[PDB]
Amino acid sequence: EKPTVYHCKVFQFKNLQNPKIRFKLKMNSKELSLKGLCLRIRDDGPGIIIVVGNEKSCKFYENLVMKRIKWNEDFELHTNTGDIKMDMHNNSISKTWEGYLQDCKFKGWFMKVCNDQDSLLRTLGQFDSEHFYSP
């Protein structure tokens, strides 16, 4: 019997190709010393964000993700072949789970692209988190 000190919030997004959005997610997780991860299915696919830490930091991060980042914002994308105008009008972010953990298996905060949905689920599985993803 021990206290439960870790808050946790989980978000799912449709597209995370905007490098400016990735930069904000990464830098705020780093500056807030949040733990968790951000996974998506292929470069241009849907994915999940999990953050774990204290209450204050998780609430700041929710406001960042749900209110301050413009997920629907068009941008120009630089690829191996050229530069293209991306249409993001259909992009969106949802908060799914929120709650408390007694312990977390996360080591820092990390971003990864997975090759398929099953790869993503397998990865969440290593952190006991596979249930957090809605296919």
Author numbering: 332 to 466
Provide text from the study.
Except for an N-terminal region, Prp3 is highly conserved from yeast to human and contains a C-terminal domain of unknown function (DUF1115; PFAM ID PF06544). Here, we showed that Prp3 orthologs contain a C-terminal U4/U6 di-snRNA binding region that encompasses a DUF1115 domain and a preceding peptide rich in basic residues. Our crystal structure and targeted mutational analyses demonstrate that the DUF1115 domain acts as a ssRNA-binding domain that specifically recognizes the first 10 nts of the U6 3′-overhang. Our results indicate how Prp3 functionally bridges U4/U6 and U5 in the tri-snRNP by Prp3-RNA interactions on one side and Prp3-protein interactions on the other.
We also determined the crystal structure of yPrp3DUF1115, lacking the preceding basic peptide, at 2.0 Å resolution. While the ordered parts of yPrp3CTF and yPrp3DUF1115 are very similar (RMSD of 0.48 Å for 131 common Cα atoms), the β3a/β3b hairpin in yPrp3DUF1115 is positioned closer to the globular part of the protein, showing that its relative positioning is indeed flexible. The lower apparent affinity estimated by EMSA is likely due to the presence of non-specific tRNA competitor in this assay. The yPrp3 DUF1115 domain (residues 325–469; yPrp3DUF1115) lacking the preceding basic peptide showed ca. twofold reduced affinity for yU4/U6stem II+13nt in EMSA (Kd,app 1.83 µM; Figure 1C, second gel and quantification) and a ca. 3.5-fold lower affinity in ITC (Kd 380 µM). In any case, these observations show that both the DUF1115 domain and the preceding basic peptide contribute to the RNA binding. Finally, Prp3CTF, but not the DUF1115 domain, inhibits Brr2-mediated U4/U6 unwinding, suggesting that the peptide stabilizes contacts between U4 and U6, presumably by binding the stem II duplex.
